[PDB]
Amino acid sequence: RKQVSDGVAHIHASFNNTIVTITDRQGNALGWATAGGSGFRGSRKSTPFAAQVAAERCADAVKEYGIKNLEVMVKGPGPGRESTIRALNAAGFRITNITDVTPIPHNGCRPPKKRRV
Amino acid sequence: FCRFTAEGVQEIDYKDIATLKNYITESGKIVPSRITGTRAKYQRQLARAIKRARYLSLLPYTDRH
Amino acid sequence: MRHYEIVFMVHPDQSEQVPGMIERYTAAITGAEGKIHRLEDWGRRQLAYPINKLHKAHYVLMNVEAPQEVIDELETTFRFNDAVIRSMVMRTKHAVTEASPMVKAK
Amino acid sequence: SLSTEATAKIVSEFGRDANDTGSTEVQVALLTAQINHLQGHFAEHKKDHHSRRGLLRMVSQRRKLLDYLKRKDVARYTQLIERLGLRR
Amino acid sequence: GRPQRVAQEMQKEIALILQREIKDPRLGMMTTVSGVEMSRDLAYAKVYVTFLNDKDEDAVKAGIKALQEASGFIRSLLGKAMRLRIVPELTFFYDNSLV
RNA sequence: CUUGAGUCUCGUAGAGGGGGGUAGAAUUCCAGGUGUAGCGGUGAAAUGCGUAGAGAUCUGGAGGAAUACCGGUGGCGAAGGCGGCCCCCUGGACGAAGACUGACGCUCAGGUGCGAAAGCGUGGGGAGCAAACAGGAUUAGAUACCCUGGUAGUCCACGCCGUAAACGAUGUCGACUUGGAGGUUGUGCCCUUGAGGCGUGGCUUCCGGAGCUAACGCGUUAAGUCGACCGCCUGGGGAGUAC
Ligand SMILES: [Mg+2]
Ligand SMILES: [Mg+2]
Ligand SMILES: [Mg+2]
Ligand SMILES: [Mg+2]
Ligand SMILES: [Mg+2]
Ligand SMILES: [Mg+2]
Ligand SMILES: [Mg+2]
Ligand SMILES: [Mg+2]
Ligand SMILES: [Mg+2]
Ligand SMILES: [Mg+2]
Ligand SMILES: [Mg+2]
Ligand SMILES: [Mg+2]
Ligand SMILES: [Mg+2]
Ligand SMILES: [Mg+2]
Ligand SMILES: [Mg+2]
Ligand SMILES: [Mg+2]
Ligand SMILES: [Mg+2]
Ligand SMILES: [Mg+2]
Ligand SMILES: [Mg+2]
Ligand SMILES: [Mg+2]
Ligand SMILES: [Mg+2]
Ligand SMILES: [Mg+2]
């Protein structure tokens, strides 16, 4: 409801979903839409088209906060980073920088065993 | 290439931040000798000096802070 | 009787407390029949990452030639003092009496 | 290992002259000095097996040096093994 | 196993080893992978890479060229990573998402 | 006697070993700020998670385990193995120039020690991971593969176990025999000196000559030409089983 006019969009790009959330520069969130919550499931739940649909649905819920300046931070090399980026770029937003911030450990924990498929 | 051999330095100071910044990326991770052309001995010295400088907070570990 | 490079940082809120600690440690290491080949007070500097939600720590360097006993109780004092946030004791095969790059800029 | 002062003193003591570092006597003396010193190390680092391999090697070579000495001239052999308190 | 399950898994693994374990400055652009399709036999696989830089062929050409030249390296990494029998031969293709 | 084998002196490189500290990412959890209906998962699904407010996001804290980048067709170690940084104790290797000892050597049945992982005993710890197990699916069938959970275990201390495709499927030591291209680590001499040139050692990777080999291949780090000692083999199965 207020005016910040300079926010940041976290894009959790999972291999099964894509979570876009715009937040105040100090981590306080404003709104969010998901590729799942945009009426998609199964395969389509993780397709770039559904990713851009979710990006636009989330943009349509923060426009009343009055922002068109964004930095975006992407996490997870899932399909649906390119899509949401170009979507929120085609939503009248000005993106100053895009940043890969996926959490990479320095050999922290043992990962789950590989799937035998 | 092999700049340290031209310098002739016995050891690379971890206090020489100006020099060390030329061997880390913006991410803050060490650059392999494969592209800087550094001799293996001096690349090991660089790794040790950079890790020491990171400990003393003279260089960042990552770019996320 | 080895050579040591001792670099430690001080809480910036105790910046003027520094020379006291400096001269105290030098007196301790010299009264233990251990020389001192260098001592530089780099002063307040901006950290490259927070340390206990903090920046602008007070760096100070020393170069000593001393026995291991005085060095270990010195690092013990470092541990049990809280005005110092982070210390570092390293060895050196020789004696270094020169200018650190953090004073050549000065 | 041994410091330069310790080795220099042991050479001067058991050797013929200052630069008699090769005699069987000084070799046995250096070996037993290092062994006695390493006893304290292995009293507490009892699972340092690599250093213990090195120690066992030096024990073995002291044994064969002593055997060569006993076979060369038993008088000096006995005098040495009594000056060091060995072979008992 | 079934070629499409292996396709999904190999897409995950190629995306992973493509984001992290690359050093070719020719690569970059947050290179994503839209998917990968492979034959009934797991011997061959075609990856559909999607670039971000301007779609001008001067750059996407160089990207696919670098990918095809590093295919051996990516194949070695895949073979040690994803635990299958034959380490398929990889063929990269620009997925023209803009139609 | 000094040529083998050792000792001393000065140095060099190293994830060699034991002990103690400490740092920074990440996973999990706990407590808050923001913020709302999904999250998670699959080839599709459900079991699972959330309206007590999850997931996502920022801040703070706890705890355990492992150390991205450097990183290497690298290095060290007898082998197994060893990877942040710092200190302490400690083993070996190599080089230069000498000095010293004077065959003190090589191999080794029995013997002694070391010896991945799993496992065992006692106590502690327990984030992640995960046999067994519990579900959800798939399937003719699933007691498998896939999914959600998940105990032992993985971690530490002290003992035990003594086995691996413990592999270079190649015992140790010594001598000799055309080359070429690298890596790594010393070192000598010379040039206006860094740079560069000419040497000379150690270790190591890859082609290949003669020779060898059933062939594949090996090829100065031999599987070539010889010597010393040790281990071992004698058709497949029965069986590394019975006693
Ligand atoms: Mg999927
Ligand atoms: Mg020795
Ligand atoms: Mg070590
Ligand atoms: Mg706990
Ligand atoms: Mg040593
Ligand atoms: Mg003589
Ligand atoms: Mg035997
Ligand atoms: Mg075990
Ligand atoms: Mg049991
Ligand atoms: Mg146990
Ligand atoms: Mg227990
Ligand atoms: Mg699990
Ligand atoms: Mg066997
Ligand atoms: Mg092995
Ligand atoms: Mg065998
Ligand atoms: Mg030989
Ligand atoms: Mg070796
Ligand atoms: Mg060959
Ligand atoms: Mg032979
Ligand atoms: Mg043969
Ligand atoms: Mg038979
Ligand atoms: Mg049996």
Side-chain angles (χ1 to χ4, degrees):
Chain A
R1 58 168 56 87
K2 302 287 101 177
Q3 305 306 130
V4 295
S5 314
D6 193 359
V8 279
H10 304 252
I11 309 178
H12 190 265
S14 177
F15 273 111
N16 296 158
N17 203 317
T18 289
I19 311 300
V20 293
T21 179
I22 286 89
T23 175
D24 160 72
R25 285 286 309 280
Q26 287 71 5
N28 288 26
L30 314 169
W32 56 268
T34 76
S38 303
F40 292 91
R41 268 282 191 243
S43 176
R44 318 184 41 73
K45 180 178 165 290
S46 66
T47 190
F49 162 62
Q52 83 187 88
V53 164
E56 293 296 328
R57 290 185 84 266
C58 172
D60 301 318
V62 73
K63 192 153 195 172
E64 62 96 6
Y65 269 88
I67 302 94
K68 63 180 181 293
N69 260 354
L70 291 175
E71 289 179 351
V72 302
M73 293 147 299
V74 296
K75 275 202 278 189
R81 324 179 303 181
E82 184 99 17
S83 177
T84 181
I85 285 309
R86 299 195 182 194
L88 56 89
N89 188 21
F93 283 110
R94 204 188 82 91
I95 54 170
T96 82
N97 200 28
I98 64 171
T99 42
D100 183 347
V101 291
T102 75
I104 177 163
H106 313 329
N107 292 120
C109 300
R110 182 180 172 104
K113 67 176 190 168
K114 308 308 298 304
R115 323 173 69 217
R116 254 184 316 287
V117 299
Chain B
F1 280 166
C2 62
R3 296 281 77 94
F4 290 106
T5 69
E7 304 174 26
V9 282
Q10 304 175 0
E11 282 92 23
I12 308 169
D13 300 358
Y14 62 99
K15 295 164 295 306
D16 205 317
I17 305 308
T19 303
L20 301 188
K21 295 198 77 53
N22 311 139
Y23 299 93
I24 57 185
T25 82
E26 291 83 2
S27 298
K29 45 206 294 186
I30 312 176
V31 187
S33 70
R34 200 178 165 284
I35 81 167
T36 72
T38 311
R39 296 301 162 94
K41 183 165 73 173
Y42 293 119
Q43 178 73 37
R44 290 196 296 275
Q45 286 180 0
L46 284 174
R48 273 196 299 277
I50 289 180
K51 288 157 178 171
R52 279 185 272 220
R54 288 166 166 169
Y55 174 75
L56 292 172
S57 179
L58 295 173
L59 293 168
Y61 275 85
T62 81
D63 47 2
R64 317 292 217 284
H65 273 162
Chain C
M1 293 300 292
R2 276 90 73 90
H3 304 254
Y4 297 93
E5 187 161 319
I6 299 187
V7 174
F8 61 104
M9 283 148 288
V10 181
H11 210 312
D13 302 329
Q14 283 73 9
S15 309
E16 284 92 340
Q17 191 45 261
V18 165
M21 305 184 170
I22 294 194
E23 193 280 344
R24 162 183 309 117
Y25 298 156
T26 67
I29 64 173
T30 315
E33 307 97 16
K35 315 308 201 308
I36 179 166
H37 295 64
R38 187 163 70 166
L39 165 56
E40 286 160 305
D41 189 296
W42 307 341
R44 299 166 76 96
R45 304 183 81 261
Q46 176 91 33
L47 270 56
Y49 55 90
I51 292 188
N52 314 334
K53 317 155 300 307
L54 167 68
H55 286 100
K56 287 305 296 174
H58 200 107
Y59 289 75
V60 56
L61 175 143
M62 323 172 63
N63 284 123
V64 192
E65 169 178 350
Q68 304 136 24
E69 289 66 33
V70 59
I71 284 303
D72 66 47
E73 68 248 11
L74 183 51
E75 62 85 20
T76 301
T77 57
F78 282 148
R79 298 185 89 267
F80 287 107
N81 185 290
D82 290 332
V84 294
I85 49 175
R86 177 166 309 185
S87 79
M88 174 142 181
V89 177
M90 319 157 43
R91 270 201 54 184
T92 301
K93 56 186 62 59
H94 298 327
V96 47
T97 66
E98 272 89 13
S100 300
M102 269 65 73
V103 305
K104 280 182 289 296
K106 301 294 185 290
Chain D
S1 56
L2 268 187
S3 65
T4 305
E5 299 296 328
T7 79
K9 174 169 59 175
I10 285 187
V11 178
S12 67
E13 205 285 332
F14 294 77
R16 172 259 324 281
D17 57 54
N19 57 56
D20 190 10
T21 77
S23 88
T24 302
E25 304 90 44
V26 307
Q27 300 195 207
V28 170
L30 289 166
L31 287 173
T32 181
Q34 185 61 221
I35 287 161
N36 288 321
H37 167 41
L38 273 175
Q39 289 320 118
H41 172 84
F42 288 112
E44 56 164 330
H45 303 323
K46 47 177 56 67
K47 56 180 207 301
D48 175 6
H49 300 121
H50 301 59
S51 298
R52 201 186 305 268
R53 172 156 185 279
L55 162 75
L56 170 71
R57 165 192 167 170
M58 81 173 60
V59 161
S60 298
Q61 81 163 328
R62 180 186 69 185
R63 159 58 40 207
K64 43 193 48 178
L65 270 163
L66 283 168
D67 289 359
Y68 160 78
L69 195 63
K70 183 173 192 163
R71 203 189 70 242
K72 203 71 196 310
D73 49 341
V74 67
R76 196 179 317 153
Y77 162 78
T78 54
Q79 160 190 358
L80 186 148
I81 68 170
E82 76 89 17
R83 197 192 298 177
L84 298 175
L86 299 176
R87 199 46 204 194
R88 186 264 310 152
Chain E
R2 211 167 206 178
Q4 73 247 27
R5 291 169 57 76
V6 182
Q8 283 287 276
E9 200 66 28
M10 190 174 293
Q11 191 203 310
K12 296 181 58 78
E13 300 308 325
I14 294 169
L16 281 164
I17 80 168
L18 182 62
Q19 172 257 322
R20 280 165 201 201
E21 294 84 3
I22 48 151
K23 296 178 182 185
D24 282 7
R26 286 80 187 176
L27 295 174
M29 68 193 88
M30 293 177 182
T31 189
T32 62
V33 305
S34 47
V36 175
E37 293 177 350
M38 54 199 321
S39 303
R40 173 262 177 180
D41 289 345
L42 304 179
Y44 295 87
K46 273 168 278 164
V47 195
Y48 287 148
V49 63
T50 299
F51 292 141
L52 177 65
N53 300 163
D54 197 38
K55 283 70 59 186
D56 49 342
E57 186 80 20
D58 62 352
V60 301
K61 181 47 151 304
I64 300 184
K65 181 77 188 299
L67 289 199
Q68 282 302 134
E69 297 292 338
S71 295
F73 171 68
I74 286 94
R75 279 186 86 207
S76 50
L77 283 189
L78 205 67
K80 65 173 69 67
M82 81 172 311
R83 183 184 254 188
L84 55 84
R85 194 195 95 214
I86 40 185
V87 183
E89 293 267 333
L90 297 186
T91 302
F92 292 100
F93 281 125
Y94 189 93
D95 170 65
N96 311 89
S97 176
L98 322 179
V99 289

